[PDB]
Amino acid sequence: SMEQVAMELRLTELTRLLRSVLDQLQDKDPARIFAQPVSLKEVPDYLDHIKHPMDFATMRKRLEAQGYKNLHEFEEDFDLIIDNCMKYNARDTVFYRAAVRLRDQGGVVLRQARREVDSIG
């Protein structure tokens, strides 16, 4: 149908905007602490601690499958990255500190993306 096409073009355009958002958020992690999943070879007990792991590579796979239907879903996954880290790692660690800086800096980027999504429909 013409409606299913128009909806697909809306999803494609959301995917384009989310791809730019993801690139901007990932620049706020220059150390690449959040780039890939926590290794279960190197942290074999991780899943006993963290029930829903997340990382930027896993978000990028979901994105390119047009697996995010709205910004809320995408923010959910970003928030898991931060929140998982802040639970697993102690406050006095490079990991925790990197998450706090990512959260703080990403907030700005996400604030305007929410406006661009509401604005462009």
UniProtKB/Swiss-Prot annotation:
Tissue occurrence: Highly expressed in testis.
Domain Bromo: from-to ranges: 9-113
Subcellular location per the Swiss-Prot or TrEMBL entry: Nucleus; Chromosome
UniProt crosslink position (Glycyl lysine isopeptide (Lys-Gly) (interchain with G-Cter in SUMO2)): 41
Function recorded in the entry: Scaffold subunit of various histone acetyltransferase (HAT) complexes, such as the MOZ/MORF and HBO1 complexes, that acts as a regulator of hematopoiesis. Plays a key role in HBO1 complex by directing KAT7/HBO1 specificity towards histone H3 'Lys-14' acetylation (H3K14ac), thereby promoting erythroid differentiation.
Quaternary structure annotation from Swiss-Prot or TrEMBL: Component of some HBO1 complex composed of KAT7/HBO1, MEAF6, ING4 and BRD1/BRPF2. Component of the MOZ/MORF complex composed at least of ING5, KAT6A, KAT6B, MEAF6 and one of BRPF1, BRD1/BRPF2 and BRPF3. Interacts (via PHD-type zinc finger domain) with unmodified histone H3. Interacts (via PWWP domain) with dimethylated and trimethylated 'Lys-79' on histone H3.
Name of the protein: Bromodomain-containing protein 1
Gene, per the UniProt record: BRD1
Full-protein positions shown: 555 to 674 of 1058
